Scaffold this active site. Sequence first.
Site, PDB file in Angstrom:
ATOM      1  N   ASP C  48      38.666  46.396  53.553  1.00 58.08           N
ATOM      2  CA  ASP C  48      38.376  45.097  53.403  1.00 58.08           C
ATOM      3  C   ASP C  48      39.408  44.173  52.807  1.00 58.08           C
ATOM      4  O   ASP C  48      39.704  44.497  51.653  1.00 58.08           O
ATOM      5  CB  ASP C  48      36.738  44.698  52.525  1.00 58.08           C
ATOM      6  CG  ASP C  48      36.522  43.514  52.842  1.00 58.08           C
ATOM      7  OD1 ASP C  48      37.047  42.485  52.987  1.00 58.08           O
ATOM      8  OD2 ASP C  48      34.994  43.573  52.687  1.00 58.08           O
ATOM      9  N   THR C  81      39.336  34.494  55.242  1.00 58.28           N
ATOM     10  CA  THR C  81      40.451  34.700  54.301  1.00 58.28           C
ATOM     11  C   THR C  81      41.605  35.386  54.702  1.00 58.28           C
ATOM     12  O   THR C  81      42.715  34.775  54.332  1.00 58.28           O
ATOM     13  CB  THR C  81      39.728  35.146  53.090  1.00 58.28           C
ATOM     14  OG1 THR C  81      38.644  34.539  52.713  1.00 58.28           O
ATOM     15  CG2 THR C  81      40.508  35.316  51.797  1.00 58.28           C
ATOM     16  N   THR C  82      41.618  36.471  55.319  1.00 59.27           N
ATOM     17  CA  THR C  82      42.644  37.226  55.722  1.00 59.27           C
ATOM     18  C   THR C  82      43.330  36.248  56.809  1.00 59.27           C
ATOM     19  O   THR C  82      44.550  36.336  56.837  1.00 59.27           O
ATOM     20  CB  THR C  82      42.204  38.499  56.325  1.00 59.27           C
ATOM     21  OG1 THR C  82      41.394  38.383  57.388  1.00 59.27           O
ATOM     22  CG2 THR C  82      41.470  39.421  55.236  1.00 59.27           C
ATOM     23  N   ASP C 386      25.598  36.903  54.889  1.00 63.94           N
ATOM     24  CA  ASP C 386      26.511  36.670  55.912  1.00 63.94           C
ATOM     25  C   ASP C 386      26.041  35.944  57.227  1.00 63.94           C
ATOM     26  O   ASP C 386      26.496  35.500  57.846  1.00 63.94           O
ATOM     27  CB  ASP C 386      27.290  37.982  56.085  1.00 63.94           C
ATOM     28  CG  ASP C 386      28.008  38.566  54.858  1.00 63.94           C
ATOM     29  OD1 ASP C 386      27.984  37.915  53.953  1.00 63.94           O
ATOM     30  OD2 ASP C 386      28.766  39.547  55.041  1.00 63.94           O
TER      31      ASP C 386
END
Lengths: 543, 534, 518
Positions: C48, C81-82, C386
Amino acid sequence: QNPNAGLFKQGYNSYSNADGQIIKSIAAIRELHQMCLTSMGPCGRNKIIVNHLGKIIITNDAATMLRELDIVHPAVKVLVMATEQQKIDMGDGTNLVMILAGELLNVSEKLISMGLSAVEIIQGYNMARKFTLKELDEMVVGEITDKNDKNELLKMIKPVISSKKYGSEDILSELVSEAVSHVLPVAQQAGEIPYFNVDSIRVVKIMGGSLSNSTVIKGMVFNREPEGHVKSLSEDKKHKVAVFTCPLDIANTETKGTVLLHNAQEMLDFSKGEEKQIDAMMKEIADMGVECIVAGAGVGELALHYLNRYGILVLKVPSKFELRRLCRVCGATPLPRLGAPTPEELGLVETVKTMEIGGDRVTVFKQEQGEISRTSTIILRGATQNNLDDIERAIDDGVAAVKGLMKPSGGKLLPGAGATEIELISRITKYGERTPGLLQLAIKQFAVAFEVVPRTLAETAGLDVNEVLPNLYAAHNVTEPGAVKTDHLYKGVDIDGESDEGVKDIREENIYDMLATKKFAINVATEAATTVLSIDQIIMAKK
Amino acid sequence: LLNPKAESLRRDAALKVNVTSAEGLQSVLETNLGPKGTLKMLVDGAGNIKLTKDGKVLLTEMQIQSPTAVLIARAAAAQDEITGDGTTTVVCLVGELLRQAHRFIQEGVHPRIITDGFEIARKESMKFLDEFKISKTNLSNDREFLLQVARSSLLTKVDADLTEVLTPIVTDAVLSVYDAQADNLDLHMVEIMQMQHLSPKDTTFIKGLVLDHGGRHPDMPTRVKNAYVLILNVSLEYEKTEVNSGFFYSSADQRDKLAASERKFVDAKLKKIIDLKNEVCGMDPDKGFVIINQKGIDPMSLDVFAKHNILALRRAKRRNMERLQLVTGGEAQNSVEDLSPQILGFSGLVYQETIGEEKFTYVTENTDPKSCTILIKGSTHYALAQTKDAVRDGLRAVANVLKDKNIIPGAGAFYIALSRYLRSANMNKLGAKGKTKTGIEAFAEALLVIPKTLVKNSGFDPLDVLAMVEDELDDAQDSDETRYVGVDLNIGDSCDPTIEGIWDSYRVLRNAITGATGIASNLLLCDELLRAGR
Amino acid sequence: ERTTGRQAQISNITAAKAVADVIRTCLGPKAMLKMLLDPMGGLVLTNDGHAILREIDVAHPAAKSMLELSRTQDEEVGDGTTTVIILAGEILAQCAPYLIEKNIHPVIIIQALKKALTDALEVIKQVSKPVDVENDAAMKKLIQASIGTKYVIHWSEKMCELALDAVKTVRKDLGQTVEGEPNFEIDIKRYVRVEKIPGGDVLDSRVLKGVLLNKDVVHPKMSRHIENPRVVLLDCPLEYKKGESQTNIEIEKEEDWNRILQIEEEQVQLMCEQILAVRPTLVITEKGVSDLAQHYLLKGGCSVLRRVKKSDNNRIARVTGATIVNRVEDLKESDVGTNCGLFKVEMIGDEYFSFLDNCKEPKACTIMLRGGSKDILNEIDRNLQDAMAVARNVMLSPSLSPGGGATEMAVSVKLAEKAKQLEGIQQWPYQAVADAMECIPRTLIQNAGGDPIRLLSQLRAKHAQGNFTTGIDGDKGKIVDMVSYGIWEPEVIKQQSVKTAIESACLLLRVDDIVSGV
């Protein structure tokens, strides 16, 4: 700069067979194998070991040396535990087990060098062990009939003392037989009901004189000063003996009860109380017929004076084990309280006297007609402490061996001085030749492992092995004019030392070994060898 | 691309580290597979030597420095709570699969394709296991199959000689502890005892319970038959205050008066106890009487019981008391005031065992104990530990086999057949992908590690015995009959596991395969190592 | 210690690139695992991205700034975010040659970055696709995208149903011309706070219109179930009355102590009578309730509940109509038992609860989350969060952008096409941003396991000629059309990711000197 690959466990000590650890463990064991090889045999020798207290320890027992030596390698620990098991279960044969395990590992090293897998070696060792155990049943020549007589007991006692104290076996065997005869009951041909115990015989030593001055006592012996004005009792039979644990003084309560004299009033009151109570208790004890009082604690001044007044023998026994022995001898029950001469708890001792042995006076509690004691004491005399210690160890070993004369192969006798070993070598060699497959090499090596005993006997006696070994092989491997072997088939390994050719027959000196001892020693040695050989990697975590 | 004062691994360094750790662990545990495996010595700083062959003990009690090896060991040991066996199998499979994956990666195969091939081969192996299992009969009289299973499970942990003694004991205990009903199996009713007096070859099976705390008296009964069991919870011994105190006397009258306070309650209880003993079995022949007396007993009452031919025990454990209630059927009496004959139970031969350092009491031979006890004997700590581990493993294996009728023949047949089926099916169907064939072949080759290790530990060359087994498998598949082909680790030639008596647990193999595949997939997906947190 | 000038710029760019390199494998369903070495000797193989970023420590201040920005994005948006970190790092890397070798001042680069951001936002808007919020099946399919590789993948159907029900229940259109017209004004945290109930299955979770309380009756012998409850809300405790400051009763005479006890009893009785004057059936007090007060209330046939914080009393007032009053003496008769369906205290998972469910939606709801263990409860709660975040993104922004890197390829292609007309030195950083935009598809290709070179060129050609309707499949790894495979993501996520990445690049470029001091 040198890279390190293949290591992932830890930087702590770790061994694997990839680097030949299977042989390194054997090499490490050899360090103490050589140490123990010098103990087995009648011509064995002691070694000097310094204790943690700064004392000097000299003994011929390999187990004692192992106990006094530091064990680090787990492989050595396996053999140490095997030796401890041998000593606990059998009481003798520690050298046999240690040397046999060492030789089995040594031959396993040769087998590994030859390229034989450890699994096949273990299987062959197990098969050879089973074959040897079965064969030992047919190797019996004589047998102990369990007559409990001194002459029959000596047959087993003499070989046990040998290899523990060389040159004095004749006197030590007689002493052990005399001590045993004092405790054995009136019975014969009964190996299923135990009669003799290892603790039934106590061993003590007195400085001065020589071993020839040793004697045997038919009862308990106390080596402490009586600390009283009464030294011994008369010869009247059935002396009542009272055993106490509380010190002979004024009786008080369990809680507190301390007596302190601070001033004149307290001084007078406590003096009167102590005098009256002690006098009353002593008078009551005497009226019951008690001639001797044994206390586990000290005796007060007034207590001593009143004991002298009534002529009561004074003795203190701070050792609880000695108190238990006295109670077993006389049947008395310890009295936690004072002034309670209960007849049901008082014991009886036929004779109580003080005897002087070598200038040292001791108190002896012995039985003559009634309440015959089941325990005996051996008193050793000698001007050398090392010799006295060696004699004590030999006596203990003999006492332990005597207990082993029960039904389970206790009475069965084998030809000693390596004759049984040579016969087993020949039989195992024949079996291995008959045995097909790779197991033959392991069987032959197991047979060869037994050659140490004659080799050790020859070396310890200063004899040339190069001549003794072929002579022994020829003597045990003979061709006779017939289908059945005859003549002297019981030739052993002689020590000579002055002049002789070949070896002497066992029957000349009656050197026999217990079947149970040898069988259990072989089993334990093979188990230890298999356990050590089965380890091909050692992994440990740092503390 | 690094921050100052930071440590990280890039390029193929992560692959090298993971492969090295996996190979190291595989080599460490290789020699512990099969009955011909080796034994390892463990010392956790205390200086005590412990010998064992169980994968869980080897992994958990040994310090591991490489972080990847730590995770592999933890994952392999986690199977103990799922199946209880296969840790070494899992480790070997993971190691060989990682080795093959690295070999293929050196040719340019991306790890993701290898993982996909591993998943496909896992599905195919699950199908093969489903089609390959044998349904064991549920008949309770199949003692032969249970003995074979116990022997197969035990030979891996013992020296092949204690088997003849331990196998029957474990098999009988597991068979008896299971009631003659559907219900379920519970090994918590099977107790294991350790004694340091005798050799391991002297171990025997105990039908009932053993009590450690008992009375002492020269006239105490040694053997009692058809005995009634009485459980009592009230003390039968003299009691003092919390603070040190006692009774002091100066005359016989005072002695008696003070001792009366101590002995009043004991005598009152003994009155009714002896009355009950006389009422039941007082005159009946060929009967006995045993009293538990959970609480302590003073020597006076012990002598009183002995003079009445009563075997009196004292200071019994609460767990032992409950087990006696469930076994002997007797109830616990809170107070003798309400003592009644209905509290009395029944038991068979009751006798005491005398040891140099302790004493034991046997309450065995019950009508329906619904429990079993196994006594372990030995002279050394390591031998006792090994025997305990072997007994527990055998108990769990037999219980699992009884619960799950599915049994997989052993002797290496399963893995060789699985590899052959995987190869043939993936070459014929060609349904996954051309490049995925690399991972499929990697999995197929890795699954052959177990038989290779078993052969190597036995001293035989795998290249010959495995080839012979492959030839026999081809012959059997060509034939219209069903036959299982394996490796004889004792003779070196091929053999049929279903005839010799070698079996493997279905759950153990399934979970081992799943765990090995998961661990390999997780590890092969590691590209870089990053250090953080300090 | 201290760095300045071109060396400082190079160090900042290197730190950004190092931060980006951490999570290069944390993109797409084929994301690979990373080894996190614990200082105590442990190891975590989590794949993750956000967890790795939060657990990976950095030294350079620029890396800390990037981590803070990623943390802020984790709250602003539920995903990307990534992508934000990777895009920012690649943009910074591509501008390095122009920043250093070409001696381009940071101001020009920042202006070019702003222009490229505007153009990228325009392109993302162009390639958007409308969404019909009234199509339940489409919303469920879109929500299933974030349920993939989750513990509730098997119950995704019920998860989507619950998420949609909760989102629609708490919807607030707020149509007006004063503050604008929001679509639904969805807020999960405040209007959809989830209560964790031990026990039950995943599919057993339900959306309840009411307030759930974890406090049971205060006495064993007290009413537990009420069909028509009447709740009274108060904060002042029921005990001896005290002043506005510290009060201590120090009495050495028994008579005075008895008098004080009598006064306390009288005050408690008066307070209980005042509470009961409205004929209530349940009393909820935030502060402690004395035993005397409990007995007085019980003798009146009214249950007693204590230790209920204002966070629960405020909601209870909404679903029961009770009026919360600080002081007991100020209690009014406005308390009613209307708009309350029941007071059932059914026990779930060996734990007692209180339910105030009704048949109305007061712009709020509580999800009765159920599961076999606390870890399962937390996992299901995160999965539901989510799913509801995805639903909120879809409903508030009914527009989708093609996935699988298609949006990034389209942005890069259009930026490259537009750069030719810039006619200025800024064209260099503009093309740098355009090239950096292509990192995402390259990362997807690398994770899938295909050719990272030829596949990217094929993607570029197809986007040029395919109207930006092609992408990379997670499994096949080939160039495929997103329409057929249905690989779509919310437009808001892409817009926010691009904005944050370009803003972070500008912020890091703007700093040319680092100095120490405090």
